[PDB]
Amino acid sequence: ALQPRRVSFRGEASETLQSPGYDPSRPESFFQQSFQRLSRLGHGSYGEVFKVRSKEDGRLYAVKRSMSPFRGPKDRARKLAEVGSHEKVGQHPCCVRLEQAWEEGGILYLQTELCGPSLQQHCEAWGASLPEAQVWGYLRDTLLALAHLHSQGLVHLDVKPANIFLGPRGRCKLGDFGLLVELGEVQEGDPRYMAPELLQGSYGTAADVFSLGLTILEVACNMELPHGGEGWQQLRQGYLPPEFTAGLSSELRSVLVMMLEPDPKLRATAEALLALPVLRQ
Ligand SMILES: COc1ccnc2c(-c3ccc(F)c4n[nH]cc34)c(N)c(=O)[nH]c12
C-alpha cells in the first residue's frame, strides 16, 4: 500500500520517516494511524486544519492537509513551498513552529504546534472593538515576528487577523507562511490588506508593515476593510478613516499613520516601530 514521505527541512523535530505506532500494512494513512483527531480548526480552499493528539506522544498539535491530490509538478512545488518558507523563518517565539511535514497520496500534511484562536476568531467572539491594552500586545508580538522575518529578507505578504494566532498569557504568533517569499514566486494576496505599492509591482518588506497597520485598524475599530473601490483608495492616501479612528488613543493613531504611509520608501520598518516608546518591552 501507499506510504508517506517526509518533506525534509532544516530544523525539523524528527528526521525519522515514521512513528513506531505506524504499521505500513494497514490501508489507513500515516495521518489516520499516528494521530487521534479531535476537532476541525478551519477549512477552505487551502484544505483543512485539525486539532490532533499524536498517537505517539499524546501531545497536542495542529495538522493542515491539502484538499485535493497534486494537480502536477507546479502545484506540488507551490504547496511544498510553504514547508521551505517555514524552514527559512526558523524558530522564533512569535512565529508558529513547524514540527514536521510529509506527503502521502498526493496530499501534503504540515504538523505545527497547537496555537490558540486566530486573531479573527478572537474578535468575532468579543463582537466589538478590542480594548487598546490587548491591541498593543498583539501589535508588539507581530512586529517582533516581522522584524525576524524581514531581517532575513523574507516578506510574509499575508499579514491579517486570520494569520495571527493567540498564545498563552496574551501573546500571539504570526503564521501561515504559504505566501512568504524570499527577496533575491509571488502569489495573489488579500486585497483588503494589500499595501498600495503592490499594485505597482513593488514587493518589499514594507508591504508587511502596511498589512499589519490595516490589521490593527480592523481589530481596534471593529470595521470591515473594503475589497476595492473608493473605500479601498481612502485607506491608502496617508490619512486615517475619521469615522472609525475616533476612540483610538493619539499614541495609537500616530503609530497607525506611520505604518499606513503610502510611499514604501518613507514607511517605517518593523525595527523602527519596535524602538518607539509606546512599544517598550
Ligand atoms: C483557526 O485556527 C487555525 C486555522 C488555520 N491553521 C491553523 C494552524 C496552522 C496549521 C498548519 C500550519 F502549517 C500553519 N501555519 N501557520 C499556522 C498553521 C494552527 N497551528 C492553529 O493552532 N490554528 C489554525
Q: How many whole angstroms separate alpha carbon 19 and alpha carbon 5?
A: 12
CATH 1.10.3720.10 fits domain 5-113: no
Q: How many whole angstroms separate alpha carbon 277 and alpha carbon 259?
A: 15
Give the list of residues 6+ apart from residue 27 with CB closer than 8 angstroms, or none. Answer: 1
CATH architecture type of domain 119-279: Orthogonal Bundle (1.10)
Q: Whose CA is nearest to atom 7 of ligand 1?
A: 49
- Cα 121 to middle of ligand 1, angstroms: 12
Domain parsing of the chain, residue ranges: 5-113, 119-279
> Is 190 one of the annotated active-site residues of the chain?
no
Q: Is 163 annotated as a binding residue?
A: yes
Please write down the HEC assignment for all residues of 53-100: EECCCCCEEEEEECCCCCCCHHHHHHHHHHHHHHHHHCCCCCECCEEE
| Unique residue bearing C-alpha cell 516581522 | 146
Long-range pairs for 221-227: beta carbons < 8 A, 24 or more residues apart: 221/129, 221/245, 221/247, 221/248, 222/123, 222/128, 222/129, 222/130, 225/192, 225/193, 226/192, 227/191, 227/192
Q: Whose CA is nearest to atom 4 of ligand 1?
A: 42
Q: Is 7 annotated as a binding residue?
A: no
Residues with CB under 6 A from ligand 1: 41-42, 49, 62, 64, 96, 110, 112, 114-115, 118, 121, 165, 175-176
Q: Calculate the alpha carbon distances from 186 to 8, 101, 207 in Å.
A: 22, 22, 13
- Retrieve residue 157's grid coordinates: 505578504
- Cα 82 to middle of ligand 1, angstroms: 12
Which approach determined this entry? X-ray
Catalytic residue among 57, 75, 141, 158: 158
Provide the resolution (angstroms). Answer: 2.0
Q: How many CB atoms lie within 10 A of CB 157?
A: 24
- Cα 52 to middle of ligand 1, angstroms: 12
Among 218, 223, 201, smallest CA distance to 260 is for: 218
Please write down the HEC assignment for all residues of the chain: CCCCEECCCCCCCCCCCCCCCCCCCCCCCHHHHHEEEEEEEEEECCEEEEEEEECCCCCEEEEEECCCCCCCHHHHHHHHHHHHHHHHHCCCCCECCEEEEEEECCEEEEEEECCCCEHHHHHHHHCCCCCHHHHHHHHHHHHHHHHHHHCCCEECCCCCHHHEEECHHHCEEECCCCCCEECCCCCCCCHHHCCHHHCCCCCCCHHHHHHHHHHHHHHHHCCCCCCCHHHHHHCCCCCCCHHHHCCCCHHHHHHHHHHCCCCCCCCCCHHHHHCCHHHCC
Q: Whose CA is nearest to atom 6 of ligand 1?
A: 49
Residue 233 CA neighbour count, 13 Å, CB half:
2
230-252 b/e (C-beta count within 10 Å ≥ 16 → b): eeeeebbeeebeeeebeebeeeb
